Amino acid sequence: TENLYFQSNAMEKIIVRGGKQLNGSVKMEGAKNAVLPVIAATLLASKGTSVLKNVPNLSDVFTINEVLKYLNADVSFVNDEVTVDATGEITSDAPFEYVRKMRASIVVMGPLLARTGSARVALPGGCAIGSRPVDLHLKGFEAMGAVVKIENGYIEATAEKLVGAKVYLDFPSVGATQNIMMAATLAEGTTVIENVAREPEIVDLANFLNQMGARVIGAGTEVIRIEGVKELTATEHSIIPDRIEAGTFMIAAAITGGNVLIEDAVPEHISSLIAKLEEMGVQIIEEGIRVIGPDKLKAVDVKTMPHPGFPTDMQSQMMVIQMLSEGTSIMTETVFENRFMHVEEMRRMNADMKIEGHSVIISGPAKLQGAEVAATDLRAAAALILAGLVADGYTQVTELKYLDRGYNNFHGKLQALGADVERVDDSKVDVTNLASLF
């Protein structure tokens, strides 16, 4: 009955034939950015069995589940439901190489530090952006009385007496906010975390800690206060819908002059995006969000900001609609200033863009052309596929491993909206006759 994870074949391709208008309905699954921390949080429950629902079928979920089992928790994953029994004696080490491959593994430190007093995790490695330093995580645990360190590819934290403390975050880190908040739940005393991430995933996690008996207030604001308690008890919780996936289909509908109904979407979680699309001429209706694309798109400048500002996860995709707008526009990053590796791939599709500082000058309207493009990361993978919907000809997108890390049956959903999209093995494709497919 347990869910099985199936590997995909290397070098598979998503071939898109542009020119089709999207029309229909699309349902969203749970957010990956919300589920990992929620699963990790189950380690805090010394009583009862946790029941998580609306859990997406993604690789990181299976991986995190394996980590928890190794931490001595009984985990089960059937359909979209995960069950966690963490009433036993929980261990504190997650050292395998597979732990490094999953950059989000660090999320178990807070819960372990609070539940067991120690945590050891293998670091993922890396230097540039796409991710940021983990210093804030340690700064927070240190303030709470822990002895910390990064040694031999390992990040560790040990606390004889985890206590409450005032912590100021240099920047609103989602990861740091999550770890510090989770660690605070069982610390002796009160913790005040300033300049925290305000993303919806943080609020959902705060709600979950509260349902388990924690005392966390302020989630969603710039300040979170946690009054530590002796113990937390298991409960049931549903993972919030993926607001980013919602944004991806909104843009797809907007650029194809479509009419799509995005089901199970919370407009409040993507106000910035909505407001920005409306400035371009797109109609957004809260029927449950319906998106109707216009004939022409008005050029508009966009600047990523910590939530509730414009989300960095919609950046690469937003650039697609910017390229099709009537005039020059600019996209700027203030969250991840180096997240523009997809620009060179969009050029192959005839895009006209220039990287300058931490901004990209986009010269629209561009007459996109089909080409062989390689995804550079999760959101970029989807961005290229969106470009394919509007490009003249056939677009072949490779490196699907990135797409699969956050989008389930992405091609199938597009097909259901009337798009000419197919996902095939490399051996099936004969470039001289892509028309054969479809």
Q: Which residues participate in the annotated binding site for phosphoenolpyruvate? A: 32-33
CB of 327 to Cl ion, least distance (A): 31
Binding of Cl ion by 375 (CB under 5 A): no
Cβ proximity to Cl ion: between 157 and 382 the closer is 382
d(CA 284, CA 56): 26
416 makes contact, choosing from Cl ion, its own copies, none, with CB < 5 to 8 Å by partner type, with none
Structure-token match 């097909």, residue found: 415
d(CA 26, CA 270): 17
d(CA 85, CA 48): 7
Radius of gyration of the chain (CA): 22
Binding of Cl ion by 377 (CB under 5 A): yes
Residues belonging to the active site: 127
Cβ proximity to its own copies: between 192 and 424 the closer is 424
Cβ proximity to Cl ion: between 104 and 183 the closer is 104
Residues in Cβ contact with 395 at an 8 Å cutoff, skipping those fewer than 6 apart: 15, 16, 18, 349, 370, 371, 373, 384, 385, 387, 388
d(CA 331, CA 362): 8
Binding of Cl ion by 399 (CB under 5 A): no
**Contact footprint for its own copies (CB under 8 A):** 4-10, 59, 62-63, 66, 70, 91, 93, 95-98, 100, 122-129, 133-135, 138-139, 142, 146-150, 152-154, 337-338, 340-341, 344, 355-358, 424-428
CB of 14 to its own copies, least distance (A): 14
Stretch of 62-70, 237-245, 328-336, 376-384 lying at the interface with Cl ion (CB under 5 A): 376-384
Binding of Cl ion by 201 (CB under 5 A): no
123 makes contact, choosing from its own copies, Cl ion, none, with CB < 5 to 8 Å by partner type, with its own copies
Cβ proximity to its own copies: between 93 and 301 the closer is 93
Q: Looking at residues 132 to 171 of the shown chain, list those that interact with Cl ion (rule: CB under 5 A).
A: none
- Residue positions in the annotated binding site? 32-33, 103, 132-136, 313, 335
Binding of Cl ion by 242 (CB under 5 A): no
Structure tokens at 75: 């985990």
Cβ proximity to Cl ion: between 172 and 406 the closer is 406
- CA quadruple 39, 41, 46, 51: dihedral, nearest 10: -40
377 makes contact, choosing from Cl ion, its own copies, none, with CB < 5 to 8 Å by partner type, with Cl ion
**Positive or negative, the Cα torsion across 214, 218, 219, 225?**
negative
Closest CA to 237 of 20, 27, 40: 40
Binding of Cl ion by 204 (CB under 5 A): no
138 makes contact, choosing from its own copies, Cl ion, none, with CB < 5 to 8 Å by partner type, with its own copies
Integer distance in angstroms from the first to the last C-alpha of the chain? Answer: 34
d(CA 254, CA 251): 5
378 makes contact, choosing from Cl ion, its own copies, none, with CB < 5 to 8 Å by partner type, with Cl ion
153 makes contact, choosing from Cl ion, its own copies, none, with CB < 5 to 8 Å by partner type, with its own copies
Q: Looking at residues 254 to 283 of the shown chain, list those that interact with Cl ion (rule: CB under 5 A).
A: none
d(CA 438, CA 343): 28
CB of 68 to Cl ion, least distance (A): 21
* Sequence letter at residue 184: A
Residues binding Cl ion: what is the number (CB under 5 A)? 2
Residues 14, 411: contact at Cβ < 8 Å? Answer: yes
CB of 323 to its own copies, least distance (A): 18
Q: Which residues of 353-381 are buried (b: 16+ CB within 10 A; e: fewer)?
A: beeeebbbebebebebbbbebbbbbbbbb
63 makes contact, choosing from its own copies, Cl ion, none, with CB < 5 to 8 Å by partner type, with its own copies
The C-alpha angle 344, 350, 355, rounded to 5 degrees, equals 40
CB of 380 to Cl ion, least distance (A): 8
Cβ proximity to its own copies: between 62 and 83 the closer is 62
Cβ proximity to its own copies: between 298 and 348 the closer is 348
Binding of Cl ion by 368 (CB under 5 A): no
CB of 111 to its own copies, least distance (A): 19
Binding of Cl ion by 378 (CB under 5 A): yes
Binding of Cl ion by 400 (CB under 5 A): no
- Residue positions in the annotated binding site for UDP-N-acetyl-alpha-D-glucosamine? 103, 132-136, 313, 335
Q: List, in sequence order, every residue forming a beta bridge with 217; answer none if it has no partner.
A: 225
Which residues bind to Cl ion, rule: CB under 5 A? Answer: 377-378
